[PDB]
Symmetry: C3
Subunit: 234 residues, 3 copies
């Protein structure tokens, strides 16, 4: 899997690598396409909203490695709103969203489930991060079914109910995304533990987004992204 979809830079002080560190490590590890997905601005220890707006200036391909502009947005409420403005959406390619205590504290199972499903149904998000987090109890099957319906991927997070999520996605028919949730570039692309979970449930390789740069880019285009010419050859 030459694609990693979830990692963080020094824009949060609880991460320690820069854009150039991720490019260099990708080069070393055979990763051909990666996304930087810094924490959304409503989070603690998070960057300013301009951090995301100004990603529009980034080079697309450096040293043969493609770079997606992303966000790990924060689910704000039971209506499925996230901390990403219209100007921010305009600059970004990949929208991940998830639960973080400073923004959305863990609540009753139904509150968590409704918020997650409303985020999925909003049409604004591509991947829900760490849905297996035991801190946020959810109706996994209902979430997987909604994710399949709205073509939203559920993440299996290497940084980490994950077998239950994987099996639920398998049966619901949706996509899985693998993400290292790296906070240094040293763990980019490392999915060993994710893969064991997927194997414990005989997850179909055909529904793993990270199989190839083209599979992932095709998914984003199906969700409405204008094609990125600079990524043709990936």
């Amino acid at each position: 899997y030459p694609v990693d979809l979830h990692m963080h830079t020094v824009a949060s002080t609880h991460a320690y690598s820069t854009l150039s560190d991720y490019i260099a490590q990708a080069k070393q590890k055979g990763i051909k396409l990666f996304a930087i997905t810094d924490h959304g601005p409503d989070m603690e220890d998070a960057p300013h909203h301009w951090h995301f707006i100004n990603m529009r200036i980034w080079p697309r391909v450096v040293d043969g490695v493609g770079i997606l502009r992303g966000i790990e947005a924060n689910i704000k409420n039971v209506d499925g709103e996230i901390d990403c403005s219209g100007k921010m959406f305009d600059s970004l390619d990949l929208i991940i969203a998830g639960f973080h205590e400073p923004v959305f504290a863990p609540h009753d199972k139904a509150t968590n489930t409704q918020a997650m499903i409303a985020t999925i149904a909003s049409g604004n998000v591509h991947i829900i991060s760490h849905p297996g987090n035991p801190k946020y109890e959810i109706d996994v099957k209902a979430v997987a079914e909604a994710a399949a319906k709205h073509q939203v991927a559920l993440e299996i997070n290497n940084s980490s109910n994950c077998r239950e999520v994987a099996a639920a996605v398998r049966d619901a028919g949706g996509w899985v995304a693998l993400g290292s949730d790296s906070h240094t570039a040293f763990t980019m692309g490392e999915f060993e533990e994710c893969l064991k979970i997927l194997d414990a449930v005989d997850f179909p390789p055909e529904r793993i987004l990270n199989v190839s740069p083209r599979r992932l880019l095709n998914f984003l285009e199906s969700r409405g992204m204008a094609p990125i010419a600079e990524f043709a050859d990936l």
Copy 2:
């Protein structure tokens, strides 16, 4: 033009490169002298004032590339004051100043013009950044005339009324400075678009500061900077 005078680091989250990234890219692109000019502390998403005071510890020359310590200060008011303290001036070599909405909102043409001219006449600034910004209407000729009188350069900004500024400087007799306004090191030294504007007005190469490291350093010394020995050989 082996000199670039305007770029930003991770000290603002809307920039993404470090000092070491700029050194490495300079090395790759044949840039022999560059200035880091982070946003002044009154700006949103800007670093602490100590970020500028502590630039006094930087090496002067790394891998053959000279490093100027700078600031893109913010014009604060119609008296021409900027967000740079005496201790900060003491640590810095290059003072750029300009209009940014969070500090000085766009106002009537006369308010903008008076503030810009007062900044020029203060004697504390070397370059006015993006004077051609249509968001801040100014009397371009009056600004160019004041800039020539006080030996302040007007910037032609590649990141970007620019032809009008260039022609005004040509006739007023002042200097132009080229700046990439890079927020990643990938665009360091890239002035293609600046050069087209200058060519559309047959701007005299003799009044472009970036022609050589020595021309730029001679300008700073004429404005009062003690000579930097470590830069002799540039």
Copy 3:
């Protein structure tokens, strides 16, 4: 001395290098073990507490260089408390502590002395940073005696009453730690000025922690640190 124990990253905007910059410079300068010791969270221009908690994810050895997870904590009061929580202690290997005006303003000699000695006697700190700072008058002999008793090293800081501190430690029988207090990686391991102070007092090399990675690691283990297997070969 292939060990440097005190340096800072971009997590403070008054520092300019990243973890990867320090690894690369260590490699270049023959440093085999270094500690990142960013300013504690109560300081101005300092990172969030999560910056220290999440250091638990760092690789231990990169390109042959070992990496200690540290903090330059701030002495908070005359009871010897510092701005380091239990969760933070759990993630860190090296605890440095010192006086910084925004947290603990310079006061009477007895106030400064009591706070420093209480920090030493707390058992939570390994090194007291810049005890020779003339801004904070202390009873040097009393501090050195307490440091020897509680097996706390006093720093001789290259960034910088230092001869008096060195002679006091010599006679009290404690350890000295050398630290560059680097705010860029370009000065990592540079102790020339520290060594002159130590030579002016014929300081015994046997009580300089930085002599070898193993001497330093043995000291941390004697203070209660579980052994770091990944550092066996250093």
